[PDB]
Design an enzyme around this catalytic site. Structure first.
Site, PDB file in Angstrom:
ATOM      1  N   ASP A  79       0.811  -1.213   0.000  1.00  0.00           N
ATOM      2  CA  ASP A  79       0.000   0.000   0.000  1.00  0.00           C
ATOM      3  C   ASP A  79       0.849   1.271   0.000  1.00  0.00           C
ATOM      4  OD1 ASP A  79      -2.297  -1.593   0.035  1.00  0.00           O
ATOM      5  OD2 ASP A  79      -2.409  -1.575   2.229  1.00  0.00           O
ATOM      6  N   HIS A 121      -4.699   7.556   7.509  1.00  0.00           N
ATOM      7  CA  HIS A 121      -4.353   6.218   7.985  1.00  0.00           C
ATOM      8  C   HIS A 121      -3.000   6.142   8.690  1.00  0.00           C
ATOM      9  CE1 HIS A 121      -7.921   4.443   6.430  1.00  0.00           C
ATOM     10  NE2 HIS A 121      -7.608   4.624   5.159  1.00  0.00           N
ATOM     11  N   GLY A 129      -2.132   2.377   4.267  1.00  0.00           N
ATOM     12  CA  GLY A 129      -3.203   2.672   3.329  1.00  0.00           C
ATOM     13  C   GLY A 129      -2.996   3.896   2.455  1.00  0.00           C
ATOM     14  N   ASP A 156     -14.881  10.053   4.606  1.00  0.00           N
ATOM     15  CA  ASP A 156     -14.247   9.138   3.662  1.00  0.00           C
ATOM     16  C   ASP A 156     -14.931   7.775   3.726  1.00  0.00           C
ATOM     17  OD1 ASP A 156     -11.184   9.019   2.248  1.00  0.00           O
ATOM     18  OD2 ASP A 156     -12.112   7.089   2.735  1.00  0.00           O
ATOM     19  N   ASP A 245     -14.235   8.666  -2.263  1.00  0.00           N
ATOM     20  CA  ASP A 245     -14.391   7.265  -2.645  1.00  0.00           C
ATOM     21  C   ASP A 245     -15.743   6.687  -2.222  1.00  0.00           C
ATOM     22  OD1 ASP A 245     -11.726   6.307  -0.305  1.00  0.00           O
ATOM     23  OD2 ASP A 245     -13.537   7.512  -0.033  1.00  0.00           O
ATOM     24  N   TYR A 284     -11.089   7.540  -6.358  1.00  0.00           N
ATOM     25  CA  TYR A 284     -10.314   6.836  -7.373  1.00  0.00           C
ATOM     26  C   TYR A 284     -10.992   6.797  -8.740  1.00  0.00           C
ATOM     27  CZ  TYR A 284      -8.230   5.850  -2.944  1.00  0.00           C
ATOM     28  OH  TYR A 284      -7.689   5.987  -1.693  1.00  0.00           O
TER      29      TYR A 284
HETATM   30  O1  SHH Z   1      -9.037   5.756   0.458  1.00  0.00           O
HETATM   31  C1  SHH Z   1      -8.242   5.341   1.281  1.00  0.00           C
HETATM   32  C2  SHH Z   1      -7.131   4.404   0.869  1.00  0.00           C
HETATM   33  C3  SHH Z   1      -7.124   3.167   1.756  1.00  0.00           C
HETATM   34  C4  SHH Z   1      -6.065   2.184   1.271  1.00  0.00           C
HETATM   35  C5  SHH Z   1      -6.626   1.250   0.210  1.00  0.00           C
HETATM   36  C6  SHH Z   1      -7.305   0.059   0.870  1.00  0.00           C
HETATM   37  C7  SHH Z   1      -6.660  -1.248   0.430  1.00  0.00           C
HETATM   38  C8  SHH Z   1      -6.989  -1.503  -1.023  1.00  0.00           C
HETATM   39  O2  SHH Z   1      -8.127  -1.295  -1.411  1.00  0.00           O
HETATM   40  N1  SHH Z   1      -5.972  -1.952  -1.767  1.00  0.00           N
HETATM   41  C9  SHH Z   1      -5.997  -2.276  -3.138  1.00  0.00           C
HETATM   42  C10 SHH Z   1      -7.164  -2.270  -3.899  1.00  0.00           C
HETATM   43  C11 SHH Z   1      -7.131  -2.604  -5.249  1.00  0.00           C
HETATM   44  C12 SHH Z   1      -5.928  -2.952  -5.851  1.00  0.00           C
HETATM   45  C13 SHH Z   1      -4.760  -2.963  -5.099  1.00  0.00           C
HETATM   46  C14 SHH Z   1      -4.796  -2.629  -3.750  1.00  0.00           C
HETATM   47  N2  SHH Z   1      -8.294   5.682   2.564  1.00  0.00           N
HETATM   48  O3  SHH Z   1      -9.290   6.545   3.013  1.00  0.00           O
HETATM   49  K     K Z   2     -14.665   7.968   7.212  1.00  0.00           K
HETATM   50 ZN    ZN Z   3     -10.854   6.070   1.555  1.00  0.00          ZN
END
Ligand code: SHH
Ligand code: K
Ligand code: ZN
Ligand code: K
Length: 356
Positions: A79, A121, A129, A156, A245, A284
């Site tokens: 991550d 995070h 994250g 979020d 998101d 995203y």
């Molecule tokens: O928006 C965020 C990011 C959190 C970190 C992402 C979570 C783990 C994850 O979804 N990983 C991932 C997903 C798809 C492909 C590769 C990794 N925090 O608020």
């Molecule tokens: K939140």
């Molecule tokens: Zn998020």
């Protein structure tokens, strides 16, 4: 009384470099620029955070390793890749949120905006994250120099665990997070039972939510929580994380929100007439994220935006309809009405203890 907009060409270019969200900072600013909203705001160039400023939360061991890794090549894994220039990236966003906080302190504005921040995070000694540095925490620590009570609100999709744990032992900062909560879903924490520890007990608020929630039910649930929180805690300043998101069309495909729904939450907070630090976060679907934060920027300014997307650098990314509004997806709301009420009851119960 004019909102502060944290921006500089160098800052946006720096933020574009994050592999998880390439060119997102540019797309967000460009759209805001295309609506000429920046001319209705006070543009402030963000300072770069010093080693001492980042150290107000993060440990020296971590900060030094992060820099060492960044110079040549602690939670640095999948991550959070240990890529070069990552410390410069971290310092820039941290300094940007701090700059916004300092603007609030000086009385330069009632609302300061940093759309490239909200990375909630990161822990004191661990990246997590997609977060290498917790700019939200840094923003709160700076605000605490002037304000006696800070309210942190996290809308979020993910639980703001890094911000919560940072202040889980204090009662001067209350953290409120609305997030998806389901076994296997990152970061896995933030149940309604989590209320904080020690003297910070009952000063952490968590609202677990399931897939498919839409504008109406989200706002009603959010308003009722914020209503009780405001009367119980009586904040003097607010930090608001508005990760996009949750918006329909996001590849995460969890919640089913539109910027209008989030906007109402923002309005309810803005009417408190308190110093408010606005942060971004997740998001995203890059075009939709720009759509959302541009819309919210218009909400802060009390302006109505044209439905049609103005031509600009990233105009082609807005197909096939090229409008500002976002249409909810056609999938169920997995939230049972009775569950929402009981979560609300627990929170009201915990906030009874907040009578000090
Ligand atoms: O928006 C965020 C990011 C959190 C970190 C992402 C979570 C783990 C994850 O979804 N990983 C991932 C997903 C798809 C492909 C590769 C990794 N925090 O608020
Ligand atoms: K939140
Ligand atoms: Zn998020
Ligand atoms: K707390």
């Amino acid at each position: 009384l004019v909102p502060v907009y944290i921006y500089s060409p160098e800052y946006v270019s720096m933020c574009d470099s994050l592999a998880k969200i390439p060119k997102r900072a540019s797309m967000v600013h460009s759209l805001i620029e295309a609506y000429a909203l920046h001319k209705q705001m006070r543009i402030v160039k963000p300072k770069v955070a010093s080693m001492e400023e980042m150290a107000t939360f993060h440990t020296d061991a971590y900060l030094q390793h992060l820099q060492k890794v960044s110079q040549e090549g602690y939670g640095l894994g999948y991550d959070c890749p240990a890529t070069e220039g990552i410390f410069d990236y971290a310092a820039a966003i941290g300094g940007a949120t701090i700059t916004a906080a300092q603007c609030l302190i000086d009385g330069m504005c009632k609302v300061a905006i940093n759309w490239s921040g909200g990375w909630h995070h990161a822990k004191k000694d661990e990246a997590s994250g997609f977060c290498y540095l917790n700019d939200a925490v840094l923003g709160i620590l700076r605000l605490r120099r002037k304000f006696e009570r800070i309210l942190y609100v996290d809308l979020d999709l993910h639980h703001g665990d890094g911000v919560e744990d940072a202040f889980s032992f204090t009662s001067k900062v209350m953290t409120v997070s609305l997030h998806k909560f389901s076994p296997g879903f990152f970061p896995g924490t933030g149940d309604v039972s989590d209320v904080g520890l020690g003297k910070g007990r009952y000063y952490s608020v968590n609202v677990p939510i399931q897939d498919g929630i839409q504008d109406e039910k989200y706002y009603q649930n959010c308003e009722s929580v914020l209503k009780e929180v405001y009367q119980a805690f009586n904040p003097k300043a607010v930090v608001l994380q508005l990760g996009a998101d949750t918006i329909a069309g996001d590849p995460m495909c969890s919640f089913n929100m539109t910027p209008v729904g989030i906007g109402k939450c923002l309005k309810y907070i803005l009417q408190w007439q308190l110093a408010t630090l606005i942060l971004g976060g997740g998001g995203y679907n890059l075009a939709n994220t720009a759509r959302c934060w541009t819309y919210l920027t218009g909400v802060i300014l009390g302006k109505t935006l044209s439905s049609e997307i103005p031509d600009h650098e990233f105009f082609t990314a807005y197909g096939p309809d090229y409008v500002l509004e976002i249409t909810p997806s056609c999938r169920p709301d997995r939230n049972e009405p009775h569950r929402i009420q009981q979560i609300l009851n627990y929170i009201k119960g915990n906030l009874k203890h907040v009578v000090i």
